[model samples]
Every structure is written in structure tokens, then in C-alpha cells.
Target: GSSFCDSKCGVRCSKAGYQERCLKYCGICCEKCHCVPSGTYGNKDECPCYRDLKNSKGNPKCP
Candidate 1:
């Protein structure tokens, strides 16, 4: 599961500025949702859970 996550997040975070932060949270959200939006930018609409997950501070949790 983690290796699969590493694969998807690699592309998903490729264009991101803080790719480390992206993979960290992307792994978390993906384990739960089992899904991740395509591409490296705003494709949140593709995965509702990835789109909506929030942190303790009520901010978006996934990259």
C-alpha cells in the first residue's frame, strides 16, 4: 500500500514546492481514502476524501 502511495504521490507532488510535506500527508490521506487525484495540481475533485480531509486545526490535511 505504501509503495503504491509512493508511486502516485511521486507524480502528484512533482510540481509542488514542498514535495516532502506533500508525500507525508499524501500517504496519510491515501491509506484512508485509497485514492488520490491525478496530476500535480488542483485535482481534488477526483477524490472526495482527498479533497476534504482536515487536520486538527481544521485545515486541509492532504497535499
Candidate 2:
């Protein structure tokens, strides 16, 4: 479906300073939302599901 988005998310997460922090969950959000933002922040309007994804602690998941 959104293999392109998924791939990009992986690329970004892998290179991120906190790669070990959000890589796995970012992949999951990208898969479910069919999109990942253009950069490290903002652009939540592009994918509402991604924007709303929350961790067990009720914090935003995607970066």
C-alpha cells in the first residue's frame, strides 16, 4: 500500500539521533497511516492516524 512511505520512515529513523528510540514504532505508524512526515517534526496534517498515534503512556508516538 504505502511501501514508499514505509521505506522513507525507515531511512529517516535509521539515521536519526534517537534511532534506537522510535524506529520500530515509526515503522508501525508509517504502515498504518500510509505516510510519514517530510522531516523530523510537524506535518501531522498529512496523516491523521500518524498524528494521533500514542504510546502506552499517552504520548505522541511518531516524531
Candidate 3:
């Protein structure tokens, strides 16, 4: 079966009421990392790119 993160990371962010920016970044991370953490937080250790992402404010950018 298709994994939830691989198949629907963007949709998960979108349906969770996140902004377009969040969805876009999530897709980027998913493409590069091939995975996204479960839920809205934590588990960044699974993906280096996803773990290192930051906003203009130097805050975490990927969910």
C-alpha cells in the first residue's frame, strides 16, 4: 500500500488548514527527504532537509 506521507503530505498540510507556503515547503521536503514526520510536530530527525529547514526568522519551516 502507498504510504500516507509519500502520497499525501501536501494534502495533509492543506487539510490541516495550513497556508499555501506550508504545503509548498512540505512538498519540497517530501521530494527531497522522501518522508515527512507524523502529526504537526517532532520527528525531524528522520529527514535532514526537513530537520534543517528554517523561515526568514530562523524558525522551523517544515511540519
User: Which structure among the candidates has the greatest lDDT?
Assistant: 1
- Candidate 2 lDDT by residue in tens digits, 1-63: 245665657555665778755666777777776677654556555555665777898788665
Model 3 weakest 10-residue run by lDDT:
1-10
Q: What is the lDDT, from 0 to 100, of the residue 45 in candidate 3?
A: 49
- Tell me the tens digit of each residue's lDDT in model 3 across 1-63: 134554446544555665466667677767776676554445444444565767898776665
Model 1 lDDT tens row, 1-63: 388778876667876788888888788778878888776657766766665777799777666
Candidate No. with top TM-score: 1
Candidate 1 clashes between residue pairs 3 or more apart in a chain or in different chains? none
Q: Which ten residues in a row have the lowest lDDT in candidate 1?
A: 39-48
User: What's the best-to-worst order under lDDT?
Assistant: 1, 2, 3
**Quick one: how many clashes does candidate 1 have?**
0
Candidate lDDT scores, in order, read 0.75, 0.64, 0.59
Which of the two candidates, 1 or 3, achieves a greater TM-score against the reference?
A: 1
On lDDT, who's better, 1 or 3?
Answer: 1
